[PDB]
Amino acid sequence: SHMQTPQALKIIVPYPAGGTADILPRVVAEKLRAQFPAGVLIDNRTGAGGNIGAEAVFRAEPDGNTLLASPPGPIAINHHLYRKMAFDPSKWEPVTVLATVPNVLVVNPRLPVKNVQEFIAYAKANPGKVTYGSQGNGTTSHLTASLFMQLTGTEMVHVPYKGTAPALVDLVGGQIDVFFDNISSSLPFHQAGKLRILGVADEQRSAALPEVPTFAEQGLPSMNAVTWFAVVAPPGTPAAKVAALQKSFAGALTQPEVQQKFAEQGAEPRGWDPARTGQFIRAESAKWDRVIRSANVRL
Ligand SMILES: O=C(O)c1ccc(C(=O)O)cc1
Fold first, then answer.
1. What lines the ligand 1 site, CB under 6 Å?
2. Domain of life of the organism in this record (predicted)?
């Protein structure tokens, strides 16, 4: 029979532990363990911008027991930018979006600038010398830095990492000068005074950090850059399986503790149905491609 095999749910996060990509699915997984009695196991599988872990899910059996929980790179973005691809992201089977989260500009608290305009001047004063970390080539932090440079006429050197976690280590350590992270992973550091967020790349401020202005409020209205964390299944996963999984994830997102934890970090829980999720990924893929084009995004 089917029912007599307990099967674990395996969720690959294709980025190092401790960033938002890792934290949000782990928070949610605590509320799914009851429905997957053989266990919910998150594995962090790093490399190639998120494409190593992504490929591993892509090639797994399309039974819904192996899923990718990822930010946009290996779902919507990197196939527009990379020299090659070992899988076809257009064939992901969308399950849901766990959260959307705005990106920010974050610096070390010793950087002698108080706001975005002063940061621009610092970059122009030290042209080609100021370095920006990223979460990897083709991640939203990469493209967000690029959009910033496009809109401001600045020239900064890209230093890609494997994800948020090692980038934040180096920004704290002073080994990079700026990072366009999402708010959720940078907020604890900002609150602690360990890092300093200069602006939020959205049309409104975050309720989690209400005193930090948007980029629009600082003279850069087109500096909008919002990431997200989706769940996708291998190509060919049945529609009713995807639907059942989306209902399980959506149910987790509404649980009070998951709501508290997402809210305190400025992550907006979504839980969108598979169709809406697929429409969103399509629209996002094109939106980020339009950034690649307008901002001359370079590997
Ligand atoms: O592309 C992104 O927005 C993104 C990439 C990596 C991580 C992480 O390492 O947690 C989070 C977000």
1. 15, 19-22, 71-73, 135, 139-141, 163-164, 182, 227
2. Bacteria
